[PDB]
Design an enzyme around this catalytic site. Structure first.
Site, PDB file in Angstrom:
ATOM      1  N   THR B  10     -63.837 -42.458 120.604  1.00  0.00           N
ATOM      2  CA  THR B  10     -64.761 -41.926 119.616  1.00  0.00           C
ATOM      3  C   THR B  10     -63.979 -41.401 118.410  1.00  0.00           C
ATOM      4  O   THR B  10     -62.753 -41.323 118.437  1.00  0.00           O
ATOM      5  CB  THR B  10     -65.601 -40.772 120.187  1.00  0.00           C
ATOM      6  OG1 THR B  10     -66.681 -40.480 119.292  1.00  0.00           O
ATOM      7  CG2 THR B  10     -64.731 -39.522 120.356  1.00  0.00           C
ATOM      8  N   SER B  79     -68.830 -41.732 123.822  1.00  0.00           N
ATOM      9  CA  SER B  79     -69.416 -40.899 122.781  1.00  0.00           C
ATOM     10  C   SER B  79     -69.910 -41.691 121.547  1.00  0.00           C
ATOM     11  O   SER B  79     -70.975 -42.306 121.588  1.00  0.00           O
ATOM     12  CB  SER B  79     -68.395 -39.839 122.386  1.00  0.00           C
ATOM     13  OG  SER B  79     -69.025 -38.803 121.674  1.00  0.00           O
ATOM     14  N   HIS B 234     -67.951 -34.085 129.609  1.00  0.00           N
ATOM     15  CA  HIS B 234     -68.064 -35.145 128.617  1.00  0.00           C
ATOM     16  C   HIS B 234     -66.980 -36.202 128.793  1.00  0.00           C
ATOM     17  O   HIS B 234     -67.196 -37.397 128.683  1.00  0.00           O
ATOM     18  CB  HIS B 234     -67.989 -34.527 127.214  1.00  0.00           C
ATOM     19  CG  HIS B 234     -68.156 -35.509 126.091  1.00  0.00           C
ATOM     20  ND1 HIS B 234     -69.367 -36.095 125.787  1.00  0.00           N
ATOM     21  CD2 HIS B 234     -67.254 -36.040 125.236  1.00  0.00           C
ATOM     22  CE1 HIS B 234     -69.198 -36.958 124.801  1.00  0.00           C
ATOM     23  NE2 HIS B 234     -67.928 -36.951 124.448  1.00  0.00           N
TER      24      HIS B 234
END
Lengths: 256, 256
Positions: B10, B79, B234
């Site tokens: 990301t 992401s 995450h």
């Protein structure tokens, strides 16, 4: 006691090689700065823009310059990092409480700035799959290199986990020893670099900075304090982080 | 079966976020490519030089272009990586065996390219200590950002070890969502990006890509296969590497 450690990486590397040591040192109460030298790590410059070890050393120099009068730090260099230390010590010795050498080169004042670099090339002549190239800067021809993956795996990250070795293959960039430039550079002074307390840290398990070389370095220029880590490899800050931090603590308690 | 995984990071990150997954995947017999997108990782470009998500996506595009006819890969984005996937899928779908979304954004074809980005900003409006700036490129004003250290620690690397978080503070660079540019970009096509098999991977423990958003994404655009990892954060490729690799293996055995 608490100290401000300035961790200096070797060529073709970045501050990331200290990703483990840094947090641990702080966990001890220390202020830790991990700098990216020119064209290293995420520094925006490219090696072709650098023309000497001194320029390469810029970040460290500027970091020191920014220290307010009275603040002293402990420089910790690894492998080729000792050269960055000598370069800075000849410009900011009053600011250096001490300098730790981590499986690093130990320049002296009686010989040219390339002396120990040349000796290393004698002991470790075959860099395996490492590749070289040449570029020109300020009328000088410079030999650039990119460390070979096998060399990293076998001689540098020998006992390091695959997850750590992976970082090296994804982060190491083009670099240079600036060896021919060092040969013509002025000798490091006895008043600056010579006056600083020097602590030499090493392991006889280093697959590149072999014992013969490191022992040769201690005899050539007698360190103020020698610490011999048992086991590990070249990258002790990865394979023996806890131990290293123990020594750095002792150093912080001895020099200020 | 063995597959060629192309791991897409990301913004503000680099290939290094896959330093753990990559080796493990190979340990399974897979060919793994971890690319650095424009101005990311050790890419020589600076964000100010990039004017859109498409340009930002360059490396991935060129990697695909270089694949010899008949070779298919599995794209794995994390992401904001899903956007890079859609951009490539609309230019090289024949080359993509499947696309895995790792706690990523899931663009669709019925709405503008910024649709899910805008929705994310609704669910996660406060990026804490993150700072922004603006630069101009091709007559467009772009909002650049540098992820805040607290945000990284608290919402991104929540359960990650201090040694991993340290890497983020030393490697994350300036980046951009190119959100305003995405708004004016053409819709992703149904023939390209729409035709590819999409596997959505997530954890309801993600402190930034919150459940409401990720669940919202699955309802908005029904994935071909959904995998819900239990636990972690995450960055599942760090906190749940083994698990992720297990899923990627299943995917390699299902799509080709």
């Amino acid at each position: 006691a608490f100290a401000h450690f300035v961790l200096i990486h070797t060529i073709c590397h970045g501050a990331w090689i200290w990703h483990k040591l840094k947090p641990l040192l702080e966990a001890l109460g220390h202020k830790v700065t991990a700098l990216d030298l020119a064209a290293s790590g995420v520094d925006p410059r490219q090696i072709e823009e650098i023309g000497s070890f001194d320029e390469y050393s810029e970040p460290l120099l500027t970091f020191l310059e920014a220290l307010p009068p009275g603040e002293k730090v402990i420089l910790v260099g690894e492998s080729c990092g000792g050269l960055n230390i000598a370069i800075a010590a000849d410009k900011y010795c009053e600011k250096i409480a001490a300098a730790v050498f981590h499986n690093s080169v130990l320049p002296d004042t009686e010989h040219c700035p390339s002396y120990v670099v040349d000796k290393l090339m004698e002991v470790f002549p075959d860099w395996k799959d490492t590749t070289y190239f040449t570029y020109t800067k300020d009328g000088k021809e410079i030999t650039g290199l990119k460390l070979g993956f096998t060399l990293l795996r076998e001689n540098l990250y020998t006992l390091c986990g695959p997850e750590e070795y992976e970082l090296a293959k994804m982060l190491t960039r083009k670099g240079s020893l600036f060896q021919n430039i060092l040969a013509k550079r002025p000798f490091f002074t006895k008043e600056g670099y010579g006056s600083i307390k020097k602590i030499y840290v090493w392991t006889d398990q280093d697959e590149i900075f072999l014992p013969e070389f490191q022992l040769w370095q201690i005899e050539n220029y007698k360190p103020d304090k020698v610490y011999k880590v048992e086991g590990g490899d070249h990258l002790l800050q990865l394979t023996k982080t806890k131990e290293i931090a123990e020594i750095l603590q002792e150093v912080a308690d001895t020099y200020n």
